[PDB]
UniProtKB/Swiss-Prot annotation, chain A:
Pfam families: IF-2B. The modification N6-acetyllysine is found at K35. Component of the translation initiation factor 2B (eIF2B) complex which is a heterodecamer of two sets of five different subunits: alpha, beta, gamma, delta and epsilon. Subunits alpha, beta and delta comprise a regulatory subcomplex and subunits epsilon and gamma comprise a catalytic subcomplex. Within the complex, the hexameric regulatory complex resides at the center, with the two heterodimeric catalytic subcomplexes bound on opposite sides. It comes from the Eukaryota. This is Translation initiation factor eIF2B subunit alpha. The keyword Protein biosynthesis applies. It is linked to Leukoencephalopathy with vanishing white matter 1: An autosomal recessive brain disease characterized by neurological features including progressive cerebellar ataxia, spasticity, and cognitive deficits. Brain imaging shows abnormal white matter that vanishes over time and is replaced by cerebrospinal fluid. Disease severity ranges from fatal infantile forms to adult forms without neurological deterioration. The disease is progressive with, in most individuals, additional episodes of rapid deterioration following febrile infections or minor head trauma. Activated by the chemical integrated stress response (ISR) inhibitor ISRIB which stimulates guanine nucleotide exchange factor activity for both phosphorylated and unphosphorylated eIF2. One of its GO terms (cellular component) is membrane. GO terms for biological process: cytoplasmic translational initiation; oligodendrocyte development; response to glucose; response to heat; response to peptide hormone; T cell receptor signaling pathway; translational initiation. It is found in: Cytoplasm, Cytosol. Keywords: Acetylation, Cytoplasm, Disease variant, Initiation factor, Leukodystrophy, Protein biosynthesis.
Curated annotation (Swiss-Prot), chain C:
PANTHER family: TRANSLATION INITIATION FACTOR EIF-2B SUBUNIT ALPHA (PTHR45860:SF1). GO terms for cellular component: cytoplasm; cytosol; eukaryotic translation initiation factor 2B complex; membrane; plasma membrane. This is Translation initiation factor eIF2B subunit alpha. The gene is EIF2B1. It comes from the Eukaryota.
Length: 279, 287, 284, 291
């Protein structure tokens, strides 16, 4: 392969299935790349392509890519362990759905932000459990991905209501819990997500509503932010500011439903070590 | 409805369905008895004559029949009463228990895991069903469980879900333990200290799993939470046991909380030590 | 003799005399094999071990350890065929083992004790008799021991001595353990690390006795010391062990689950067996 | 030794040393009774039992829990060789260590400059606060006078004689005063299986008010006070523990103790360690089985 063929197999892998995590698409592309040819001679040939996939700022593409590489270790066994990794990361969503939909009381009113493939999967699991619940979702500027989310939920016949980003503090009082996804989960158990998440978390804590995060383990990223500035620019981009993500501290999170299990923010560091040192 | 009717009604509830739990069949019978108790009159006597029947049903040594029965009468605080509204709301909820537990627990059965269980358990059965429905691949070892051999019945039920299963002697438990990844067991009752009262042979299976670091999981409904705190076997009421050249034949033994890893309930996953807080909330439900 | 006779002789040793250990019954048929066998040389040494395996009819571990020990200590030498006199010697010595043991044990069974046992054991019966008839009052608990219910058989034997005895289900060992003072058990075989192979169910009884701090004592003859070094159930040879069903006749109990072993060689803690075993196998 | 003797020996022990836990005074006289008892083994048993209950003439849960635990730990020609007395003294030697272990564990949680609120008189809380002055910590106390025996006042002097600032307040001013406190430290007459506690009437009220203002509620108590009860409400505390203790119009209400559920308690400081209410059931099993 090469640059032309990478930014392809990848970019279209996502077209054939827009339900697929940005990260999985990429890992899928690498695994494909290893299925190319003519030792460490190739090991550098790969690293040179994750950066290439820097054609998508996603924290996940970065961290998942790193994890995929670390999992690998003539070069057959590498295309094997890599397949055993892909097959594994694509089981995360079912796991997160099983684990989390259980925390949704029947008759609950849930508040979410923007669009999340995993959250959606969680709510589907809940209807499949015969749970009756309502949903409020932010419209989420500037791409209005919350309206997208509302549409998807409407098709699963879930009563959903779209409110303005500015109305979270206002609507909070009538919600029982908050469930949002993540772009990445940092070392301290906090999360990086679509701009607006932080405010929702702050507002939920003020009224004592549990704040749940659902995200795959491959989004575990090696960063320890102390505030909004410690979040690398590459992941978020005196008259106008436009960050796509913001950071939400562990103190503002109740639990994180991950494929590694249900976790408190502080328990994340232990899991993140076991994850990166897998084998 | 009189005593004759009750015992008949209760027995035909399980009749029309062997897969029903004893406490649920018993709770439904209190609901009918309640309904068919217009002959009564004072809101007090309904609640009073209703206690008289629990005992009648007590003709089922089962622990759950007591706790389910007690919990039922509790969830219910003139001649015209809305108690029945609560009694049906109560029935409506304990009927979701077994299933909440199955989709709560199956997620924890890893692929290729070998599971060890004891005798026959309706809850454990629903759990495994959810696991094959989840497309998971596992195998099972189950004690034949003397003296009624319910383990063999359990095994056949599993065989009909196409789950690979092997029946082994109650004595082969410590032997087979090394080839199991985890242990899943049901319960006749969940005690205040997070421990459990179950079919004889459970205690030693737990001790054995403990010595090999094998996780030990209990899956049980909340109506099985009972107001007892035993320190050893002797502390278990005979009403539930049937015991302590002679012979002894206790039908149940006691498993301490130090021997249980997690309990999977309709109230969520619990560690043994957290059972006491949930039992409180559960018994003071009405408030 | 010939295969036929061999087995027929063996089976008719324990049948008319169950009192006798399989191992001992095996060397007896072996003395006769040898005796009744005339006309050789190495032929003898080979035809004799090539039929000792035949006595495998008894998947019993003792037949194997016994046969070897017996064979090893008579081979030291048709005048050389006076191995027979060593065989009578050996068979004469091993027939004192039960007794040295029942003696090394009268001290540990204290007046008023409650003993928990598993299945049937001739050596255990002996020890308790040498204790009761020896002015001691105790009561016993024994597992019925599926599948041949040999536990009930043991019970009856204990009743005949008017010792109070209660039979419980194998499933009730962890239930009855709190009311036991100690457990005494026999062994089909003592392995090189001080552990033991015994009737299925023995293992879990030891694990429970240990969690409740109850001393676990094994009572067995030195001719049961076998050359095997298992670390788990999987290491025990199938040859001794025998919708699916698994029916292992015996299981292994690691040495850390054993307090003391009483043998004709003296009372031993599990970590002493290995050295004894060798100091035993290597005897002139 | 007959009943009159027991009682006098028991009250002497308490007059001898007023800082001695009531339960400690009790097992001591049980030990003395066991030493004199000139009566077979079975006798000795119900004898050292049909007196422990006689000591029950101090309707305190502790005296009951202590005795029970003592008989348990002590229990097991043969006659005389009773190694019971030896075990007895050993048990006695360990429980007398407890109070200090609590002092050490707890004072660590008293932030310098903190205002602590207490209820009635508690010997262990007194020891905890001494362990605090010793650690060079500066704090101030607020304590309820505690009707009807006004034991809170006596607590205030003890503290005054230790030089710690202390203010006495009416039992009715706890909700009012809560505002000024940083935390609540109260003792216990008994710790029940669910982690809750039985203590001087007025305790529950303080814990409920503490929780409402998110003030940490700490309990300091020796493990011989772990009792086998699982109360669900006030009516569940046996009457022998709340009455005779220390027409139309009725003062018919003079309970000496009340119950404080596990959800109103933050931490229990024990010789067995710093435990959260849920962890109590496992320690109570270990305590009662250890033997
Ligand atoms: Cl998906």
């Amino acid at each position: 392969m090469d640059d032309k063929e990478l930014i392809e197999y990848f970019k279209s892998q996502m077209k054939e299935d827009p339900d697929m995590a940005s990260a999985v698409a990429a890992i899928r592309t690498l695994l494909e790349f290893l299925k190319r040819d003519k030792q460490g001679l190739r090991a550098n040939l790969t690293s040179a392509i994750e950066t290439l996939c820097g054609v998508d700022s996603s924290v996940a593409v970065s961290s998942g890519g790193e994890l995929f590489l670390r999992f690998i270790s003539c070069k057959k066994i590498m295309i094997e362990r890599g397949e055993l990794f892909l097959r594994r990361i694509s089981l995360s969503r079912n796991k997160i759905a099983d684990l989390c939909h259980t925390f949704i009381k029947d008759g609950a009113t849930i508040l979410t932000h923007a669009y999340s493939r995993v959250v959606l999967r969680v709510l589907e699991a809940a209807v499949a459990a015969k749970k009756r619940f309502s949903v409020y979702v932010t419209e989420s500027q500037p791409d209005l991905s919350g309206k997208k989310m509302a549409k998807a939920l409407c098709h699963l016949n879930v009563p959903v209501t779209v409110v303005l980003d500015a109305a979270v503090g206002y609507i909070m009082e009538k919600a029982d819990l908050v469930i949002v996804g993540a772009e990445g989960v940092v070392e301290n158990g906090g999360i990086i997500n679509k701009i607006g998440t932080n405010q929702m978390a702050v507002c939920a804590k003020a009224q004592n509503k549990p704040f749940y995060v659902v995200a795959e383990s491959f989004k575990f990223v090696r960063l320890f932010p102390l505030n909004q500035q410690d979040v690398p620019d590459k992941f978020k981009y005196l008259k106008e500011e436009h960050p796509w993500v913001d950071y939400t501290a562990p103190s503002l999170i109740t639990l994180l439903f991950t494929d590694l299990g249900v976790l408190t923010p502080s328990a994340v560091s232990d899991e993140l070590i076991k994850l990166y040192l897998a084998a």
